[PDB]
Amino acid sequence: LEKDDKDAIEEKFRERLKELVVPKHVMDVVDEELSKLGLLDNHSSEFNVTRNYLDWLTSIPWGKYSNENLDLARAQAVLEEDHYGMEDVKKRILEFIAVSQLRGSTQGKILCFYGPPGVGKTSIARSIARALNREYFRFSVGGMTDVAEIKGHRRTYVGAMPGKIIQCLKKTKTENPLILIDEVDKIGRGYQGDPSSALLELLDPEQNANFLDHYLDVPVDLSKVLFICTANVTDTIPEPLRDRMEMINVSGYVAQEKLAIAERYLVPQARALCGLDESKAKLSSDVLTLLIKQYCRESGVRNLQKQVEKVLRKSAYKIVSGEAESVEVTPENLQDFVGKPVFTVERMYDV
Amino acid sequence: LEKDDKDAIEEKFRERLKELVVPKHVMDVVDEELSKLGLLDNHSSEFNVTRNYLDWLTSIPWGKYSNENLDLARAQAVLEEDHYGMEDVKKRILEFIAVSQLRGSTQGKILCFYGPPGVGKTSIARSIARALNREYFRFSVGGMTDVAEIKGHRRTYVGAMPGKIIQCLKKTKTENPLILIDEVDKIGRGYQGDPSSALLELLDPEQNANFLDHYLDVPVDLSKVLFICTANVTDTIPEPLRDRMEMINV
Ligand SMILES: Nc1ncnc2c1ncn2[C@@H]1O[C@H](COP(=O)(O)OP(=O)(O)OP(O)(O)=S)[C@@H](O)[C@H]1O
Ligand SMILES: Nc1ncnc2c1ncn2[C@@H]1O[C@H](COP(=O)(O)OP(=O)(O)OP(O)(O)=S)[C@@H](O)[C@H]1O
Ligand SMILES: [Mg+2]
Ligand SMILES: [Mg+2]
């Protein structure tokens, strides 16, 4: 077993590294460690750390890129297909694809939506990632207070693994994932190395190219990512970190727009969810108008979500074991069919 | 000792996996960990760690569904006899089962109760779980501050164990237990990682499907669950969290 066994894996790391355009910072560090692996007995207690370190270091993609759809004409459709309104964020992504159409190679940026809850902030990134066609990911940071998740540990410790971003980058083979940090403003104070101190080193647009996770210390390029971050309010963020990234402000909706979203997605979205059908559980557009005028006039689009869902489920139970084979919601019933209205119709002096 | 060995623990895990209908995603992580176990020397700190983490990955049910009852009036009996009145909630759950019976497969939701103390808000939960047949579980959050309790720890720490809900879930084989958070108003805040920062990830009606626990990183779909939350006065709850979950006033 002089040439057997060890030669297999040592060749294996070659093969997996062949196709990549390995950066020169790494290519020195790799092969000498492969030599060190070639020296020692397979059962040597260190061998299982080195065999691990290569398995990560051979595996994280190095300059491999998932070519993105570039034409914006077709981008308009898919960007619109799954959300309505929100024109300014649509325009910002259109600008980004425009620039990337201009200067050849793909390139990243950072952004930070923020605004009223339920505007659609978290609900868009999946759409964008389908739009550009760069690989999606998501990574909530809410309440996190341990920097190790953004960094990893030193590999001296048993079982140490690289910071979460590297696990992402392995799991989404392309080098330019659409990372989506989330709920940034509610990130915790860990009272010993809180994460806000960490994030600045990642998110700085110029310094980002040399992020260095503690586990495998070799620098990784990261300009290509398109980070996105969201928060319902933008005061908790420390001042420099607030400086680092653009703050698009998602807008709250208005009752014309609420009705607009209503017919297009919401009612179908839940009618399929409950299994009802057209002509068995019909809703007038005037019922949808009245729900907004009376029962829900808040900036979000969750509240109306719950009204228009409950209105269906009442009909659900009212059919399957009730006496009517088909409900037909009409305005005359709503005051009882959903509860008493919140908003009053301010009609005091008609005389 | 029945010849304890690498291939034996590898088998017992493998056999344990079969009945489950695992998501294709986590199956690959398990297959890598299995090879990494087999190569690893038997007695070493890395080995016992990785064996433990793989044990947890097999222990979590994947796709098991304790049967949800379907009959309405027969459920109405068990929801009526042991708690007088409170027509609102007894009507709500009845509507919900009417839907779940209608659209085939079981499906979760989320909701919350609020009102004067002693109205029975906590009392009704176990009656519900007996009515719909979902396995019960409860865990007060009152006064809790350490966020890790609902998200575990990194697993490279010596004794780290997965967050609370996963412990709730391994013990009761259903993928759809009726978790019953209690006293949401009085979660700890203002000096350590607020649990409220974390709860949004759970209670998001749709995004919960990729809840991601620190210990076992692999996303844990839990959309089928039926959370319930209680709080005698609905003011201390920060607004974004109050958005997620429909209020009901006994
Ligand atoms: N223009 C839109 N079209 C369709 N659905 C929308 C739109 N805007 C918002 N939504 C809905 O908003 C819901 C939640 O989206 P989210 O962005 O998660 O809400 P949110 O604004 O992130 O609130 P948070 O979680 O407090 S930051 C989803 O059910 C979407 O369907
Ligand atoms: N309709 C009812 N039938 C029978 N017992 C009831 C009813 N409503 C309330 N109770 C009683 O309410 C008592 C306590 O119920 P709880 O739900 O704990 O009250 P509570 O409203 O939860 O108050 P908390 O603990 O401050 S939130 C039990 O002894 C029940 O027997
Ligand atoms: Mg959100
Ligand atoms: Mg109680």
In three-state form (DSSP H/G/I as H, E/B as E, the rest C), the secondary structure along chain B is CCCCCHHHHHHHHHHHHHCCCCCHHHHHHHHHHHHHHHHCCCCCHHHHHHHHHHHHHHHCCCCCCCCCCCCCHHHHHHHHCCCCCCHHHHHHHHHHHHHHHHCCCCCCECCEEECCCCCCCCHHHHHHHHHHCCCEEEEECCCCCCHHHHCCCCCCCCCCCCCHHHHHHHHCCCCCCEEEEECHHHCCCCCCCCHHHHHHHHHCCCHHHHECCCCCCCCECCCCCECCEEECCCCCCCHHHHHHCCCCEC
Measure the CA–CA gap between A153 and A151, rounded to whole angstroms.
7
Planar angle of CA B237, A181, B218, nearest 5 degrees: 90
Numbers of helices and strands, H then E, in chain A:
15, 6
- Under DSSP, the state recorded for A295 is I
Q: B185 φ, ψ to 5°? A: -60, -30
**Between A and B, how many residue pairs show a Cβ–Cβ distance under 8 A?**
109
Burial class (CB in 10 A: 0-12, 13-18, 19+), B60: buried
Task: State the amino acid at position A335 in one-letter form.
Answer: Q
Task: State the amino acid at position A125 in one-letter form.
Answer: A
A160 and B155: CB-CB below 8 Å?
A: no
Nearest partner of B141 among B211, B188, B201, B203, judged by Cα: B188
- Under DSSP, the state recorded for A184 is G
Residues 6+ apart with CB under 8 A from B96: A313, B109
CA distances from A34 to A13, A46, B246 (A): 9, 13, 58
- What is the enclosing helix (H) or strand (E) of A81? helix A72-81
Mutate to test the pocket of ligand 2, among B78, B88, B89, B119 (most ligand atoms within 8 A of CB): B119
Measure the CA–CA gap between A106 and A122, rounded to whole angstroms.
24
Q: B181 φ, ψ to 5°? A: -60, 150
What token pair was written down for A186? 């509610």
Contacts of A167 in chain B (CB under 8 A): 217
Measure the CA–CA gap between A295 and B228, rounded to whole angstroms.
24
What token pair was written down for A149? 């998740």
The CA B66 to ligand 2 mean position distance, Å, reads 28
The pairs formed by B95-99 with CB atoms below 8 angstroms and a separation of 24 or more are B95/A313, B95/A314, B95/A316, B95/A317, B96/A313, B97/B68, B97/B69, B97/B70, B97/B72, B97/B132, B98/A313, B98/A316, B98/A317, B98/A320, B98/A321, B98/B72, B99/A274, B99/A275, B99/A313, B99/A316, B99/A317
Letter string b/e over residues B63-72, b meaning 16 or more CB atoms within 10 A of that residue's CB? eeebebbeeb
- What is the enclosing helix (H) or strand (E) of A318? helix A303-320
Looking from the CA of residue A122, the nearest atom of ligand 1 is 17
Q: Is the CB of A117 under 6 A from ligand 1?
A: yes
Measure the CA–CA gap between B63 and B66, rounded to whole angstroms.
10
Beta-bridged to residue A113, according to DSSP, are: A230
A321 and B151: CB-CB below 8 Å?
A: no
- Beta carbons of B27 and B63 less than 8 angstroms apart: no
Measure the CA–CA gap between B34 and B25, rounded to whole angstroms.
15
A306 and B210: CB-CB below 8 Å?
A: no
| Resolution number, Å | 3.9
Residue reference for tokens 């269906």: A312
Mutate to test the pocket of ligand 2, among B113, B122, B123 (most ligand atoms within 8 A of CB): B123
B96 contact A CB<8A: yes
Per the document, the length of chain A is: 351
Alpha helices in A189-276 (DSSP H): 195-203, 239-244, 255-261, 267-274
Task: State the amino acid at position A350 in one-letter form.
Answer: D
Nearest partner of A298 among A48, A116, A85, A90, judged by Cα: A116
Q: What is the maximal distance between C-alpha atoms in chain A?
A: 104
Angle between helices B6-18 and B45-59 (to 10 degrees): 10
Task: State the amino acid at position B172 in one-letter form.
Answer: T
A158 and B192: CB-CB below 8 Å?
A: no
- Under DSSP, the state recorded for A262 is I
Task: State the amino acid at position B110 in one-letter form.
Answer: I
Looking from the CA of residue A261, the nearest atom of ligand 1 is 3
Measure the CA–CA gap between A166 and A225, rounded to whole angstroms.
12
- What is the enclosing helix (H) or strand (E) of A307? helix A303-320
CA distances from A307 to A203, A251, A262, A339 (A): 40, 22, 11, 10
B98 and A320: CB-CB below 8 Å?
A: yes
Q: How would you classify the pairing of strands B178-182 and B229-231?
A: unpaired
Nearest partner of A34 among A60, A61, A16, judged by Cα: A16
Q: Is the CB of A188 under 6 A from ligand 1?
A: no
Q: Is the CB of B133 under 6 A from ligand 2?
A: no
* DSSP code string of A166-180: HHHHHHS-SS--B--
Contacts of B204 in chain A (CB under 8 A): 122
Q: Is the CB of A119 under 6 A from ligand 1?
A: yes
What token pair was written down for A35? 């030599």
What token pair was written down for B238? 């920060």
Measure the CA–CA gap between B121 and B125, rounded to whole angstroms.
7
What token pair was written down for A175? 């080098």
Helix (H, G, I), strand (E, B) or coil at A263: helix
Residue reference for tokens 């001042």: A239
Nearest partner of A224 among A62, A25, A94, A57, judged by Cα: A62
